[PDB]
């Protein structure tokens, strides 16, 4: 994996979070159900400092691979090992009490996952329960489901208490209209004012080469409609790539992504305040 090369231009304002990444310690094994480890090396706290140094990263949202399935402890090893500048998001459901909640939430658990494609361990039939616990808790919820089902999901992502996170892009794999239903349903969404979208890991719906216009093009619709509502990521350790040839550069990957939204300010509150807000971190 490449963890060096050039800043990004412009610099990364100072409190900059990457909302989305996977860390990996040893003697974590993967869980049934899931894919497996990364087969190698294993990116974990060292490789991940190398990543935050080159793009003037800050802080750093460290959430649950599909790998480790319902057992959050590698997560919250990744966090404690990190230090101040990280926090958690990891996987609950029916059986989490409350005291489990506040066991999380002390040990930096800013929020829990729901994943409804292949590998994950909490799809969206349970997305009751781990919202209502969140609400509970005042967490997010990051929600990551195939996004040409949106319509199909909506009533009950209306009833979403929490804040959440819709992540990916919306992993809309086979691209939605800029003007369709879809995009009219996402914005109403956004306009409750409990919901975030994710500007992470653009490679894995586009169906374009670089620079992933298909992408771009209802990206630069969301981001100009709520600019107060995107937040970025990394999608390190990039683990649906398994050769050194096709691994992104993350310095131009979040060039091309932060020039989606409409103005500076947008790209400061992208890195800053709006994930201080989704994840309700002491400002910086």
């Known amino acids: ?16 979070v990457d909302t ?12 049934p159900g899931g894919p497996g480890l990364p087969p190698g090396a294993l990116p974990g706290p060292e490789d991940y400092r190398r990543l935050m140094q080159w793009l003037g990263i800050d802080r750093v949202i ?14 919250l090893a990744c966090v404690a090992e990190m230090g101040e500048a990280a926090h958690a998001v990891v996987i609950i459901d029916a059986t989490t009490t409350e005291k ?15 994943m409804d ?19 509970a808790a005042d967490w997010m919820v990051a929600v990551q489901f195939d ?25 809309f794999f086979k691209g939605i209209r800029t003007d369709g239903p879809e995009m009219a349903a996402l914005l109403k969404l956004i306009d409750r004012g409990n919901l975030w979208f994710k500007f992470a890991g653009v490679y894995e719906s586009s169906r374009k080469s670089w620079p992933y216009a298909d992408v771009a093009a209802f990206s630069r619709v969301i981001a100009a409609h709520a ?14 790539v398994r050769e050194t040839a096709a691994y992104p550069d993350d310095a131009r ?32």
């Open 1 to 16: 994996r490449k963890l060096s090369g050039t800043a990004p231009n412009p610099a990364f304002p100072r409190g900059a």
């Open 100 to 114: 489990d909640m506040e066991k999380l939430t002390a040990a930096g658990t800013v929020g829990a996952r729901i």
């Open 117 to 135: 494609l292949p590998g994950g361990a909490v799809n969206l039939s349970e997305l009751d329960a781990v919202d209502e616990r969140a609400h």
């Open 227 to 240: 600019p107060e509502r995107i937040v970025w990521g990394t999608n390190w350790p990039h683990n649906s």
């Open 253 to 284: 990957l979040a060039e091309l992504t932060l020039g989606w939204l409409p103005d500076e300010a947008a790209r400061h509150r992208a890195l800053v305040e709006n994930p201080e807000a989704l994840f309700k971190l002491s400002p910086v």
């Open 147 to 171: 996004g040409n089902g949106l319509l199909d999901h909506l009533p009950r992502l209306q009833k979403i208490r929490s804040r959440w996170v819709f992540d990916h892009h919306g992993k």
């Open 20 to 31: 989305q990444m996977h860390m990996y310690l040893p003697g974590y094994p993967a869980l």
């Open 62 to 75: 460290i959430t649950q691979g599909n790998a480790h399935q319902r057992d959050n402890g590698n997560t």
